Amino acid sequence: KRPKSNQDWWPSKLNLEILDQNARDVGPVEDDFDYAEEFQKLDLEAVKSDLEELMTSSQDWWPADYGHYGPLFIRMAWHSAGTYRTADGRGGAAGGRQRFAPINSWPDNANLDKARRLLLPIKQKYGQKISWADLMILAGNVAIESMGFKTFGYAGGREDAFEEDKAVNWGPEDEFETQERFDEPGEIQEGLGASVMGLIYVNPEGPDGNPDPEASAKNIRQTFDRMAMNDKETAALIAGGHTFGKVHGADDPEENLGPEPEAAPIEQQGLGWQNKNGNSKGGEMITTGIEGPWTQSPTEWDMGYINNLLDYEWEPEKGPGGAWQWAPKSEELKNSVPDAHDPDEKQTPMMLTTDIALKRDPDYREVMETFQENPMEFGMNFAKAWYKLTHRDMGPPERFLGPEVPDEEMIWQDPLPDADYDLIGDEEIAELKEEILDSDLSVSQLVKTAWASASTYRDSDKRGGANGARLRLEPQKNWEVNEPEQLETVLGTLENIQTEFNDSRSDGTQVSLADLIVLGGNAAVEQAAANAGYDVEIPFEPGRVDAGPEHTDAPSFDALKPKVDGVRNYIQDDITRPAEEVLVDNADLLNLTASELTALIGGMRSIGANYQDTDLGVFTDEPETLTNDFFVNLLDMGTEWEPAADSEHRYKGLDRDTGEVKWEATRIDLIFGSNDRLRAISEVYGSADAEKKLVHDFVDTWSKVMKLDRFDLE
Amino acid sequence: KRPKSNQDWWPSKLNLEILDQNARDVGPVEDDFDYAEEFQKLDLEAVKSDLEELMTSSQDWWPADYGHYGPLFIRMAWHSAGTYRTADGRGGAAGGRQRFAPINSWPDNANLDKARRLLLPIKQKYGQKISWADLMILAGNVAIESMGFKTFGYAGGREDAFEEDKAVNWGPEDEFETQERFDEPGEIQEGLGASVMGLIYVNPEGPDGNPDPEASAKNIRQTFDRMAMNDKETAALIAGGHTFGKVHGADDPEENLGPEPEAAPIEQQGLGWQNKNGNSKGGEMITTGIEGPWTQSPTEWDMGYINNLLDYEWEPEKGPGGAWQWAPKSEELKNSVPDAHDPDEKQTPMMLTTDIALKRDPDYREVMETFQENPMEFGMNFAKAWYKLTHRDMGPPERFLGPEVPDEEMIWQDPLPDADYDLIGDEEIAELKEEILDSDLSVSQLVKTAWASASTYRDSDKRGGANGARLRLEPQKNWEVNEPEQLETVLGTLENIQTEFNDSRSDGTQVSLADLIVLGGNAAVEQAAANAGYDVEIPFEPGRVDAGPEHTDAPSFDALKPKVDGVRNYIQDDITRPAEEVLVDNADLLNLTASELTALIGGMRSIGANYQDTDLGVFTDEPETLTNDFFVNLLDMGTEWEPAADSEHRYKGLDRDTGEVKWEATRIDLIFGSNDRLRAISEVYGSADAEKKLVHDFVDTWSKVMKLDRFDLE
Numbered sequence A, B: 001k002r003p004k005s006n007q008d009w010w011p012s013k014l015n016l017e018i019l020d021q022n023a024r025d026v027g028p029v030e031d032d033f034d035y036a037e038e039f040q041k042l043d044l045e046a047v048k049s050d051l052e053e054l055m056t057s058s059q060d061w062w063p064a065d066y067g068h069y070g071p072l073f074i075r076m077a078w079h080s081a082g083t084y085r086t087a088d089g090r091g092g093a094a095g096g097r098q099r100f101a102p103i104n105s106w107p108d109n110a111n112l113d114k115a116r117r118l119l120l121p122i123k124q125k126y127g128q129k130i131s132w133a134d135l136m137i138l139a140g141n142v143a144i145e146s147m148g149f150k151t152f153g154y155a156g157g158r159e160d161a162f163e164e165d166k167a168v169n170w171g172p173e174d175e176f177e178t179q180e181r182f183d184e185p186g187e188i189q190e191g192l193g194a195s196v197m198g199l200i201y202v203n204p205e206g207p208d209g210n211p212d213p214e215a216s217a218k219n220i221r222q223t224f225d226r227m228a229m230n231d232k233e234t235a236a237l238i239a240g241g242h243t244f245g246k247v248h249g250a251d252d253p254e255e256n257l258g259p260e261p262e263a264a265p266i267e268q269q270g271l272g273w274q275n276k277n278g279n280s281k282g283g284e285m286i287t288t289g290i291e292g293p294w295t296q297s298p299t300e301w302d303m304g305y306i307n308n309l310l311d312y313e314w315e316p317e318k319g320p321g322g323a324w325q326w327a328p329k330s331e332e333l334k335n336s337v338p339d340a341h342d343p344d345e346k347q348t349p350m351m352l353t354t355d356i357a358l359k360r361d362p363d364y365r366e367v368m369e370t371f372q373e374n375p376m377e378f379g380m381n382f383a384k385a386w387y388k389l390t391h392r393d394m395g396p397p398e399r400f401l402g403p404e405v406p407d408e409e410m411i412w413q414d415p416l417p418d419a420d421y422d423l424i425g426d427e428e429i430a431e432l433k434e435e436i437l438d439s440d441l442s443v444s445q446l447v448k449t450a451w452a453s454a455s456t457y458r459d460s461d462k463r464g465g466a467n468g469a470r471l472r473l474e475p476q477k478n479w480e481v482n483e484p485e486q487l488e489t490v491l492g493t494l495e496n497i498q499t500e501f502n503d504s505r506s507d508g509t510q511v512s513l514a515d516l517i518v519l520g521g522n523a524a525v526e527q528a529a530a531n532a533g534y535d536v537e538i539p540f541e542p543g544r545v546d547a548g549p550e551h552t553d554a555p556s557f558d559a560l561k562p563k564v565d566g567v568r569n570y571i572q573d574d575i576t577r578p579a580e581e582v583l584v585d586n587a588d589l590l591n592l593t594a595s596e597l598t599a600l601i602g603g604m605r606s607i608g609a610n611y612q613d614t615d616l617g618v619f620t621d622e623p624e625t626l627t628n629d630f631f632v633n634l635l636d637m638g639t640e641w642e643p644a645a646d647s648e649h650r651y652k653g654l655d656r657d658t659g660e661v662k663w664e665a666t667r668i669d670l671i672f673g674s675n676d677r678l679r680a681i682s683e684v685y686g687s688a689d690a691e692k693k694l695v696h697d698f699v700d701t702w703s704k705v706m707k708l709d710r711f712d713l714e
């Protein structure tokens, strides 16, 4: 048989495997392989041209609906991106992870295995010059254009992954298609982008299986919100999407379909959901168990969805697949649509409960009425929403590659202004460094501030970072954890230095505040390393610009607000998970390994950049002196730890003999002396001959983070 | 709140996580770090001195029994190495994985956490000069020595790991201290080195908690047997070991012992089994539940154990912990032992069912009585057994470091003779290759033999390999998988070449057959790459020697016989687990990553090197031509797969269109097209631009395997 993981014996075991994924890069791709350069060689048109032909080139193992694969492809692209949550920036189409488990075997993704397979020849024909990730999205764009609708634009740059993202928590559900995340529609558990396990957003039949339109709209609203989309956008996407294709439910899924890809027989070769009677189906295709098309020309762009929905009355019912769907009360629409694979046959259009919801909900109804009224208005709303949906997790404008990239930059891209001046030289740097070090700013003020600036970055959707100095703008400048008043004192001193330096210059040379913040932090760290007798030259990359409120959709940054900050030992008093889990989860967003996280926090405590300047976890007598004191003192058996009475996050380190309190700390600090893998790393650094190693590891990690968002020069 | 791994949703999903461990090296240690080197700097004498000192430096947080930690440390090293199994070479102490879960939290390791803790100060003092793995075994040694007994020797070199070995399969059970592996004592499930999940070998209370000295001996023998130990060794170890220390269990641990390390509070800093009524008590100490010493002088080496067990008779009785144990029927030995912690108290000796199993079982008594007669024979066997027990998973002599390594090289180290001649230069290396390609031996044959010669290497215990050429000796020359008669022929031709080469040498240069075997493969791989238009030169390391049958424990090599071999597509028709699972398991013994495996096999099928020259998986038109034809043809949807009629491992690839039989394959071939992650790699290599990459990735993987045992170069 198979082994048994440690998570099985102890459920609460810290999941450090998410950090290990950051150590190596599974897959056969070279380390020095620059995907950007490869795509830069791709001939996008030839690919789009080939996809054009595929659109109507039906293979027998999965005959095209209406002799056109367009609709199916669209559903595939939309699902590839639709798993995206704003809370952590994970999911999405950035890695093309729909291809790996568990996503590839999600109920909602039924038969998308066949759609991906169809792209296999083209994918092999261009090879590394196009990722599955970029390809699935482009397959949607081409599909949409081929059926008569122009797209706002397209961009390449999405690098394929070679495994699932272990960091993503898809929910508490223990079974697919079931939910334990909401008691009332619109009341889903924090951080989740769906209302049901295995589904992209909501249950197509209605909440909890009930054909309640009004209720459906509440979950549609919340789920989409948690995906960075409003009413206009949601309505446009749902309506523009269902303008094409159909839903397949010839018969009940729970009896006619085989195991999902992951549970399928090896001779299936990655496919799954094999239909008992056959998979080369047409008039018997089953996907979700719901049957029928939405419009009269499922392969053409038009006002078919909106007109069918708004101009006719619909009644709930049980379809041939035994699932909820709606039909018209009139005989006008009956048999007005040709059968997906048959000539001598017509089909009556249908409507999902989630569709009736755009009509029953009063706000979705205004928006929909507007659209029906102005096709041009609905067209662009859909064009722009589609473009945002499929590029939302790619990062700033610098990352979007190719000839079809819109000259216009959207706000959600968190655009950065150009630096219209000359970059400071090696001489100005040392100059400004001393200037800063001469101010009344402590090493802890400079470190804390630079940490607040760069720590907002998250590798999941390439958002945040220290470039742009958004830390001084809303909402970051007012986040509790950034100690607003404290931050203001520091930012003032730096802005003055920026002004003074900018004025005295007589050659167009200027220095951005965003740049000074980080530099002032490298200086503080160097100084802390100097107070311990270590000469270190921290690499500084000048070039960061200062973004303005006009380049910041303030409300969207609230998503990057940390609930826990290891480095500053901050724990919001309401988190559900234990501090350490969030610690690890946040660490993963900064691409840290268990070791890098360990060196960071450890080195930090010796310095003392704590929130509200506490001493929690500061196991040293010489603060602002970079040493391995944290590990040495933490591991001292002479000291014993116990929870602090009437405390929720505080712990006391007592002398096992005298009983006297020696230190105070949190789970963030203690986790490195309890978890077996981490304690093992704390022993290396806590050894008598490793201080220099720690100093250097801490610096490396500190430098890595400061530059995380420096995409332009990667 | 934690990501529900793909493991739960699909309990049968291939576990590629073990191959992922080979892609990266978790832990804060530099790539260019040579432990064996940092070790050479270590003043071993200083370490031993501090170790003997620590032996009588009791810590208030865990008082030293009898005022000496020696016995406890002996157990620590005992359990540290006693988890080794010859079947896969896993377990052991060569990595010191006792520190990591699940091992560190196994019921049989209760309180061993305090034992490893007592060694923290020392480990810290010496840092990278001594690994935890080497320190634990060195502590057991030093523990015995200070108790009047010299050790046969000691060798450092065990590299510290920073995580468990996810590749180890400890058993099918779903709970600790319960077994579902054996009905009758001695009918244990093959592949397992213990009779009960969570134990090192067996249950100290006898099979299923039943004090049946006879049945206990039946398992005591199969366990030690599966751990490379015979009767004499089994008796000496157990007896010599129990000549020290006692068994603790003042009360029932089932109700007086806190959570095990992994499930203990964070304040307990990695420690576990917190005594409910005072952990610093000492007098009140609970570990396994059984209470009492074996000898009247627990801190003195002598015949106390064998004397008490043989000179008197014992009877069953539930001890002060609810566990089965024995005591003297006669009241002569009553209070013959001083109390471990109470200066004003005495205590009566006790024996475990495992200690009575040695008296009852025939072949055991014979040994025990021979020992009692000759105290020296007991010594020579125990000393040598203790040395074999703590070093058998470290590899050949090449890997034994330090100033205390015995000069006499043991048989279990699988010694290799010294080349008594001059190596061959690039000049001769070139000739030899051109000469092997002039023979009538085909690429297939050459490639196949080289693989048979090296594939036996396993990273777990560093055994097997192409150096020594055991392939031509017993038992390997007669392994079904090697095709004896075929192997016979190939070697003959190679030997004739070795001959004609050595005889023509006007100097002292001579070529081993071992080198020639590997030099044949390399040249054959280059030829195959040449027929594909790629000119490649594989790096070759001359210097291997030919081992003789004299210094070869033929029987102990059966554990290296594989039941599956993807390169040659060999599948034993008795393997319980699915072929692909074994394929992965073995690939881990070779330290290959998902990618490497994939390239290896895919490239190999284009060459055609199957067991019995079958056309299984050979999806190519031009064999012995290294290309990416395997991936191109495995991925072609124009082909459909299905299980073969009346065949266990066979699958046929028909033409979706015609229905004509296109290819034939086995799960080993088809897995690369079914598993999500593996398929991701196959698509890379099967692209219209991957061939050259595959050829190079193939050579590098092949070149790697050929050198797995070349420690001498490391």
Ligand code: HEM
Pocket (backbone or CB within 6 Å): A065, A070, A071, A072, A073, A074, A075, A078, A201, A202, A203, A204, A220, A237, A238, A240, A241, A242, A244, A245, A246, A247, A248, A249, A286, A287, A288, A289, A290, A352, A354, A386
């Ligand atoms: C409130 C969120 C929505 C709900 C619950 C939902 C619903 C569903 C259901 C149940 C199906 C049928 C699949 C099948 O049986 O084959 C389908 C697909 C389809 N979806 Fe939607 N979806 C949502 C929206 C979106 C968006 C946001 C768009 C695209 C911008 C779009 C896309 C399409 C197209 C083109 C098809 C038909 C594919 C074909 O004919 O193969 N969907 N959807």
Ligand code: HEM
Pocket (backbone or CB within 6 Å): B065, B071, B072, B074, B075, B078, B201, B202, B203, B204, B220, B237, B238, B240, B241, B242, B244, B245, B246, B247, B248, B249, B287, B288, B289, B290, B354, B386
């Ligand atoms: C069939 C195999 C054996 C069984 C099931 C077994 C049994 C046990 C158990 C139940 C304990 C006591 C744990 C406790 O209460 O603290 C103990 C330990 C002890 N064992 Fe064994 N053992 C085997 C053999 C061996 C071997 C081969 C060695 C090492 C050469 C060894 C040496 C020791 C020592 C020195 C102690 C006492 C530790 C102390 O004072 O704290 N044993 N054993």
